[PDB]
Design a protein around this nucleic acid. Sequence first.
DNA 1: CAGTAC
DNA 2: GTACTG
Length: 247
Amino acid sequence: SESVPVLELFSNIWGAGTKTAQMWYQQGFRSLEDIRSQASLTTQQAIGLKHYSDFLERMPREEATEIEQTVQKAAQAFNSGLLCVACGSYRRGKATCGDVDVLITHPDGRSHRGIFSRLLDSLRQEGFLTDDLVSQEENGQQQKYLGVCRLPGPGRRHRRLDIIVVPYSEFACALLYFTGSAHFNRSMRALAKTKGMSLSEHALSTAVVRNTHGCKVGPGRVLPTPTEKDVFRLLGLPYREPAERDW
DNA sequence: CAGTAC
DNA sequence: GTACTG
Ligand code: NA
């Protein structure tokens, strides 16, 4: 077909963006069959293709809830003090959701540990996680999983599921990042930056030293933020409900 | 870099 | 904006 439409068709594969699409085009590929049969695929790219149709589909809010509950149960079977919160556009209150993002913490602040690995394994045994895309054990005290799940039953679609385990001391800044929106986060962060601060999914910091050209050359002190409201407060911002963060 | 998460 | 792995 015409260039722009096939670049589109290719870019909707998870793991492939505009550079990969163009390369595939120059190879002569024009269809998804062309891709699965001739193209070099990362493991994740092969998964995105396998679930191409399902991944373009959005789910009802209800279905997200069901997904969060599946994750919640499995974790609580490990510790019931574990706090599990679906975030994302779901938290924001959207009718539909493109994926599901589940945040997991423990109030006692110690016990979120050793949960991540056993939680995924549990979900796999159930038949719930069907494929895995990415795992991060390398972000401090936060553990992140990107995978694919499917609820039990007839006529269920595969869904994109993120699971994140954070320590209670970071629960607030993490909750802020996973609820979003993405445009909302740039705004908070850019703002913090103008105020000599910095915001991440780990913590809000003050006394962040930047140099002449604006670049960050020293971190600051991390300010304790036990609640989302605290972050907003310390940035001189009227607190906003998740539903008001959908920018 | 490329792609991804929000 | 901040930050992870492919
Ligand atoms: Na894509």
